[PDB]
Write the structure tokens for this entry.
Amino acid sequence: MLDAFAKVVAQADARGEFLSNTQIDALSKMVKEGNQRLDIVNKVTSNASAIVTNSARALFAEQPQLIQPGGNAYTSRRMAACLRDMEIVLRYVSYAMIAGDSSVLDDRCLNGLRETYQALGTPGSSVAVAIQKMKDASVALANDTTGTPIGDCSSLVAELAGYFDRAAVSVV
Amino acid sequence: MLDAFAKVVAQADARGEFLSNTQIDALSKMVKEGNQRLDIVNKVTSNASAIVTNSARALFAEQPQLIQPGGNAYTSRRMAACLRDMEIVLRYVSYAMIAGDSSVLDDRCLNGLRETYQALGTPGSSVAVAIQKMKDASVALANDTTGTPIGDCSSLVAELAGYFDRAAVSVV
Amino acid sequence: MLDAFAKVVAQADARGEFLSNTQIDALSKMVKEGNQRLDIVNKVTSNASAIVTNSARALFAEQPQLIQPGGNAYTSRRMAACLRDMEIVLRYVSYAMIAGDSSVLDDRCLNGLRETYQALGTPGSSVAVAIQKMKDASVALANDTTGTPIGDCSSLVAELAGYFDRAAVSVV
Amino acid sequence: SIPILKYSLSTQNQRVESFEVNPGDEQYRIYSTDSLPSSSEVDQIIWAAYRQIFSEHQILKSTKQPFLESQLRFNQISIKDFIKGLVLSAPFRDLNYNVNNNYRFVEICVQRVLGRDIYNEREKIAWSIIIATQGLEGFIDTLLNTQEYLSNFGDSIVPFQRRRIIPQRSKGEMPFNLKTPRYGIEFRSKLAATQFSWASPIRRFRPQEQQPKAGDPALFLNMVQEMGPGL
Amino acid sequence: MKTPITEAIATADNQGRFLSNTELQAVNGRYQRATASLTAAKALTGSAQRLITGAAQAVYNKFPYTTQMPGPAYASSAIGKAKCARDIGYYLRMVTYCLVVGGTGPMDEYLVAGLEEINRSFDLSPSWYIEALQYIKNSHGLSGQVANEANAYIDYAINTLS
Amino acid sequence: MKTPITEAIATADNQGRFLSNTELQAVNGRYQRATASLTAAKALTGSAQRLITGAAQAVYNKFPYTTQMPGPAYASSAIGKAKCARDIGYYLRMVTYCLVVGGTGPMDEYLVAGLEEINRSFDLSPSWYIEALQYIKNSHGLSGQVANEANAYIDYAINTLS
Amino acid sequence: MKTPITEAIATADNQGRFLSNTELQAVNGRYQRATASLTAAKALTGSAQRLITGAAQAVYNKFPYTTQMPGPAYASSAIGKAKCARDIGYYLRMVTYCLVVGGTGPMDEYLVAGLEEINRSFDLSPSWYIEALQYIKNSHGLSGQVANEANAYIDYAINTLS
Amino acid sequence: MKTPITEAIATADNQGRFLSNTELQAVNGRYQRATASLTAAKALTGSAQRLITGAAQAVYNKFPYTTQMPGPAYASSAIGKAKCARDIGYYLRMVTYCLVVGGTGPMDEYLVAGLEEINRSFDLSPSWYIEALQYIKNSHGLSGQVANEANAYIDYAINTLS
Amino acid sequence: EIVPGSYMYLSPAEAAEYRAQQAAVSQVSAAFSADVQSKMAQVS
Amino acid sequence: DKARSRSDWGNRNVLPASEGDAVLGRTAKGAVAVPEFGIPQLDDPVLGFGPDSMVDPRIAEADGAVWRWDAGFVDESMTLASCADISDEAVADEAF
Ligand SMILES: C=CC1=C(C)[C@@H](Cc2[nH]c(/C=C3N=C(/C=C4\NC(=O)[C@H](C)[C@H]4CC)C(C)=C\3CCC(=O)O)c(CCC(=O)O)c2C)NC1=O
Ligand SMILES: C=CC1=C(C)[C@@H](Cc2[nH]c(/C=C3N=C(/C=C4\NC(=O)[C@H](C)[C@H]4CC)C(C)=C\3CCC(=O)O)c(CCC(=O)O)c2C)NC1=O
Ligand SMILES: C=CC1=C(C)[C@@H](Cc2[nH]c(/C=C3N=C(/C=C4\NC(=O)[C@H](C)[C@H]4CC)C(C)=C\3CCC(=O)O)c(CCC(=O)O)c2C)NC1=O
Ligand SMILES: C=CC1=C(C)[C@@H](Cc2[nH]c(/C=C3N=C(/C=C4\NC(=O)[C@H](C)[C@H]4CC)C(C)=C\3CCC(=O)O)c(CCC(=O)O)c2C)NC1=O
Ligand SMILES: CCC1=C(C)/C(=C/C2=NC(=C\c3[nH]c(/C=C4\NC(=O)[C@H](C)[C@H]4CC)c(C)c3CCC(=O)O)/C(CCC(=O)O)=C2C)NC1=O
Ligand SMILES: CCC1=C(C)/C(=C/C2=NC(=C\c3[nH]c(/C=C4\NC(=O)[C@H](C)[C@H]4CC)c(C)c3CCC(=O)O)/C(CCC(=O)O)=C2C)NC1=O
Ligand SMILES: CCC1=C(C)/C(=C/C2=NC(=C\c3[nH]c(/C=C4\NC(=O)[C@H](C)[C@H]4CC)c(C)c3CCC(=O)O)/C(CCC(=O)O)=C2C)NC1=O
Ligand SMILES: CCC1=C(C)/C(=C/C2=NC(=C\c3[nH]c(/C=C4\NC(=O)[C@H](C)[C@H]4CC)c(C)c3CCC(=O)O)/C(CCC(=O)O)=C2C)NC1=O
Ligand SMILES: CCC1=C(C)/C(=C/C2=NC(=C\c3[nH]c(/C=C4\NC(=O)[C@H](C)[C@H]4CC)c(C)c3CCC(=O)O)/C(CCC(=O)O)=C2C)NC1=O
Ligand SMILES: CCC1=C(C)/C(=C/C2=NC(=C\c3[nH]c(/C=C4\NC(=O)[C@H](C)[C@H]4CC)c(C)c3CCC(=O)O)/C(CCC(=O)O)=C2C)NC1=O
Ligand SMILES: CCC1=C(C)/C(=C/C2=NC(=C\c3[nH]c(/C=C4\NC(=O)[C@H](C)[C@H]4CC)c(C)c3CCC(=O)O)/C(CCC(=O)O)=C2C)NC1=O
């Protein structure tokens, strides 16, 4: 997989180049954000079961057909596999957040997921609503200031919510 | 796989219903003629080798181009594979006779079998002739009155004839 | 496998105790030794091909019966395995240097190595000679103050030499 | 005595060498009992074998085999017997064998036990008659006793998807659990409690997916949380 | 499903064998237990709503905090009381499904697989569902072998809940 | 072996499960069929002196070359005749074991396992043994379900010989 | 155990590798954060009895049926109250073991592996232990990156129970 | 890539887990080292052509037969000197990639994998490139922890050729 | 000894036959040493 | 509304469509914005990244533009490269 420092090395090599001082100076701007990026994945990991079950509870309150007899999240083995899917997607968005780009999310999670749900009969447009409810549960948690020094991590909030958007358009 | 009893249950669970009183009474009618159902698969199993080898012998008398050179049943390996295909299909019809429905016949035997014979170059219409030659051979045994109390099994024999007929249209 | 921090935890759980302040303050002394420990491991891993090759070449100089026709290092497939076996042991000694205790040297390298060498006919006393020639080739390198701040790290070279004696008495 | 029928090979990644001394982050984590693991590390061998044979979605409490686990912890069975014992287990027959036919069950067990894809369609046809004439217990024994299994995994390594990513690339072949789920487009129709087979995206009068434009004050919001110190 | 018909096919199927006389006796044993087993499944079907509402009231008497404590897991809402009686109807419907097929087939597939995972996620105590099943076990009013068949699957759900 | 009692234990043992109601009805189907099985085993045991030497002569009447042709595979000698009567006594004794046990368990592990290699090596034909087995099915002299249970294991031995 | 040092060795032994700068930097990140986590384990150890008796009382205020309901699972007797404060001490001790080691290794081996079969069998509720751990998170009195280290292992124990 | 970041994601994903503090400390140790490791890459890039044409001349001094002997494998032509200074710059550029990434990622993918098969086929002796890397190891001019980072990747390249 | 790792174990009769057959090729490397006197203008 | 909170990144807005709409500091994906070009090593026609040195295959998977769900993935099944050259005379005369 690639991280954000390995994505610039692969672009540079493909043209047989060194890295200029302008490119190095933009990679040490990525290092200085290093402790605020680690606080964001720590807040998502530490609350990871309340992200998943509060947003699954919300998903069936407003789409109650999914848990009725004949639905897809009916019959508790399929209920447990439904919550497994939300923890899986939340796991790889957490991986793509420390890496700095979404390549481990792209081929280990989302690659072939839209075509998997069509072979199972799972509503892939309702999985995207499940990802979108974990999106703002995780954003409201990362904007929350508890346990953190004063300062700024607002360009990183907009980045974490973009991996949740990538995961949600790849499944519809 | 399902039997006749779990077929009603799996259909009732997708509606979220209990079974009605006319569904329990239609199930207890299967129990009343359960001894005559077991006498049918006792006749078929006990002569299962003679059903296969007599109907295969009659298939090549009337289809003599299967065992000419170039034919699909010409070698030692292609001919013994024709005999075991008849013994597989005759085995999965008797699995559908004690179950009550053709759910083990469709899932384990007939699913994707027409496309397999098309990939092998096996003439699928002649496999249907061999299944129909096994149909009347085991119906003639099912109507035998030896070692049984005399009664009416004619609705059960017409069900066994429908399992061989389903296998013969699912293979061409 | 264990490190030195989990060695003192596996012993406190077996008596159901919290760690006392003396065991905590003995562990934080190991933390401030941590930069000097990473210097020793870096000094070995960057000279690893010359530790193996020189102490091999010094072994078949004083023991020419090993590489004479009929010896246990003749016929280059056996010569390639003698160089692999030297590299394996030096690899797992440097693993037990960052850990702080030889639990990774004991199980996944040294458990069953006297038994293996006796099965093949390898002279296990000659293996102990080769291990003690990579000991004083890397004790001499960890005492080299090239590119380090000049402080005192004599207690960790007496530790690194002990893992080489541990592997040398375990094959004879 | 009816030998297996001959099929043709195909070009795949694992048939050919990667010249990779010093593998990287896409090396796929050998789980072996040849490294003498402790109790905390034999739990990781067991979870890796459950994930490989079952899905991640079939590692429920009602699925785990507690007595096959304790014979591995006492060195009575090997990892090749753990992998065989998971395929002949009652959860695998119920959730996977009963909702596939004989041709799609071969390609599940080739992908998950041998760690490679099928060579062609005729390889599914060639192996599906080992199931129908000898059972699952005869099919998994003739699949674990091939030279493809004993050379790659031996009898003390958990299988893995062999050679999935090429060393330069960032996009590799699809993982075998996303490529082949529990049941396919047949058994989907009505045999697995299913309706309507597709769904349009959810409509709403509060749009929820508005893209920001070039003068929006949240793109400059950066240092809005707090001003930097100094003079 | 685990059914004495389908567990008899699936022992001849695993060896590629025809159904010998070993498996016809297993089907026969189902056919002469099915008379007492099918009357229990319709005596519980007709007496459903008496047994549902009484069993949910029996949980509320033993554990009265479940009607008072605020939060989504408890039946202290009008929504949570509806979801409680929905659950007792699931457990009672699976027992009547097991009696009409023989053996613990439908409740193994539809209820107990993944049951521990969803109890822990949604904070649902399995001691609640044991008390609701001890009510049904005492109050179905059946006797003879009709009560033996009924209590055989009530006790199965109790054994896997605890 | 392959008793319905041991094939119900080994079913529940391969699932790590206590004996549920799926297995107890398989056991009770053995007990219902048992009194028609243990009387056929009792009837063939006492009538074995007639049914063996009657069936040995039924082979020599259909295949008379097995008494005249020289060689070790044929019964043209007293050694070959006494080993031919020994072979029919193996088939009859295995049927009475399958009636006592119930199901084709004893004659699978004792008789049919590896038999095709024995007939092919020692040049002796399986069509000789089928004519002997059709004699015993025609002359055991039972009726009811005592004959229908006994003929179910003669017909299993014929279906393995062809 | 899973420590940051044994997870750097295992990823280097899997690749057949000497300890590169990928692995020396990872062990160096443990040594940097070990100053903040060795004072969290020293401050949680020294104030342990204040935290155990407090966190057991926080379960009794929140779920007061556990002191009133009769039975062996509940803290209604003096035996069942000392078994509760025993268990709170087990969870607090594993958190200090993870702070000195770094990484959730001691409680993955001593506590969480097999925990759900204990709570199911003895009818213990995992929401009793979440309420106890949420007291210790709010009452340990740490601040800065010392509280950040301690709360990261409290929340690991809650996520295995939730 | 053998980044400390992608090695942390891989150990978490091996066991299907979230990123705990075991893996966040490996990422943090990369950031503490990235200051000295990025000033080394800036100074090696700025002295690139000085170090490349110097190291090429040091190979022609120690191995003067490489400029005289005829054949395609040697630097005895104008094309062989252009392809020789191409290869010095390849080894220098991969070192600087490892300094901006952290850990021996780019050198393993782009340089070391397959190097032994190339140097055998085209008859390129690996002792030439060792002499060229020993020049850069002595002439980059850095000191402190900045040379300590730089030499750890010159030495890693020498151990692969040796 | 042939080379320091390759040897010939021969009887004392037949070890004379090994040495007196490579002195029987040492009289033809005394005869291709007159291939250096006719380096130029060989067959004219 | 216009993305104003950092709290509404999870609630309402998704991510910048084009890279001119990125956050203050970063690219469209969210990583830090680094200049694409470094110093070229070995400026040389025959040996060096000339104009016709063929593209890295690992430049797209490193981009993340090969995966269909990411915005960089352009599909060329409907672009002009997939249309037949009419100046080819084998294709004109057949299609006449
Ligand atoms: C062990 C794993 C591990 C972590 C979890 C982090 C934890 C961590 N974060 C910060 C430090 C910080 N963390 C934040 C982050 C935030 N503050 C806020 O108001 C926001 C709510 C939130 C961002 C979303 C800020 C703003 C700083 C310090 C200011 C700065 O570095 O410029 C520091 C101290 C660095 C310093 O002193 O400069 C540490 C150790 N680092 C690690 O190594
Ligand atoms: C476990 C082994 C086992 C079997 C192999 C079957 C076979 C079987 N069937 C019947 C019992 C019966 N069998 C038949 C069947 C038939 N009558 C006909 O005229 C047709 C030829 C044929 C149907 C095709 C009927 C009609 C009865 C009912 C008895 C009767 O009507 O008098 C009985 C006796 C029980 C009774 O008298 O009711 C037995 C042993 N049942 C078993 O339990
Ligand atoms: C990324 C990888 C990595 C490394 C390689 C080390 C590198 C390193 N070593 C030291 C610092 C040191 N390193 C050593 C070790 C030695 N000095 C000697 O004279 C001996 C030859 C050798 C021990 C046998 C000593 C002794 C000090 C402290 C100086 C002193 O008191 O003598 C320091 C300064 C911090 C401190 O003072 O502790 C650093 C960064 N750290 C890392 O993070
Ligand atoms: C070792 C145990 C053993 C036994 C207990 C006997 C039991 C026995 N006797 C006969 C068979 C017979 N049994 C009798 C006996 C009698 N008939 C009468 O009229 C009298 C009342 C009674 C004697 C007191 C007769 C007359 C025959 C038939 C002739 C014969 O077979 O010798 C048969 C074969 C017929 C059958 O039952 O199917 C058997 C098993 N034989 C044994 O091998
Ligand atoms: C690591 C990357 C990865 C992903 C993402 C993944 C997804 C994945 N989800 C699956 C099933 C499932 N997914 C769902 C999910 C849902 N159903 C709904 O109604 C909801 C809308 C939704 C979530 C709440 C359900 C119910 C199943 C069970 C299908 C079945 O077996 O019936 C399956 C089928 C295989 C099986 O169940 O054994 C796969 C492969 N697998 C992977 O390996
Ligand atoms: C789902 C249950 C199931 C069935 C029923 C099944 C059939 C099946 N029949 C096959 C072949 C075959 N089947 C036949 C049979 C016939 N051809 C004829 O001409 C006759 C009309 C007919 C005999 C009645 C022949 C000739 C082959 C191919 C043998 C060969 O190509 O060597 C094969 C290919 C395997 C092989 O080459 O041996 C399969 C998989 N497989 C299954 O998994
Ligand atoms: C757990 C990690 C691990 C260890 C520790 C290990 C040891 C090991 N060393 C071996 C052989 C060997 N080891 C040597 C080494 C030597 N012989 C000498 O005379 C010298 C004194 C010495 C070299 C310095 C030789 C020559 C063989 C080959 C023996 C043979 O195949 O005949 C073999 C036999 C397999 C083979 O032939 O390669 C094993 C299993 N293997 C492992 O996987
Ligand atoms: C057919 C197999 C099957 C089972 C067993 C099953 C259980 C089940 N019970 C649930 C909820 C629930 N169950 C209850 C029930 C109770 N709480 C109380 O206080 C009462 C004492 C008790 C009634 C006995 C409540 C209140 C919820 C809602 C929990 C929540 O929304 O977070 C949920 C969450 C989704 C929902 O239904 O809203 C599942 C999946 N679902 C299934 O498909
Ligand atoms: C318990 C299971 C079992 C079976 C089934 C069995 C069969 C069996 N029959 C055999 C021989 C024989 N079987 C026969 C029998 C016959 N040939 C004829 O001409 C007659 C038609 C027919 C008698 C009805 C003869 C003549 C031999 C001797 C062949 C020889 O020794 O070469 C032999 C060779 C050893 C011997 O008995 O001398 C075996 C193993 N053995 C067993 O242990
Ligand atoms: C180190 C890892 C570890 C854990 C986690 C552990 C838990 C554990 N808690 C137990 C019991 C118990 N735990 C409790 C605790 C409580 N019940 C209440 O009502 C209170 C609300 C709550 C206290 C907070 C009680 C009352 C029992 C006794 C249950 C019984 O005896 O039936 C038992 C049964 C045996 C015994 O201790 O007597 C185990 C094994 N044991 C371990 O070795
Ligand atoms: C990015 C990683 C990478 C490396 C390391 C690499 C090396 C490399 N050097 C090569 C050739 C060469 N390399 C040299 C270099 C030298 N010969 C000498 O005498 C000098 C002493 C020495 C210069 C130090 C020469 C003369 C050739 C041409 C050999 C031939 O074409 O047969 C070739 C054959 C193709 C070619 O470039 O012409 C490769 C693949 N290629 C790569 O892609």
Remarks:
- Residues 30 and 44 of chain I are 24 Å apart (CA to CA).
- The helical segments of chain I are 14-22.
- The longest helix of chain I spans residues 14-22.
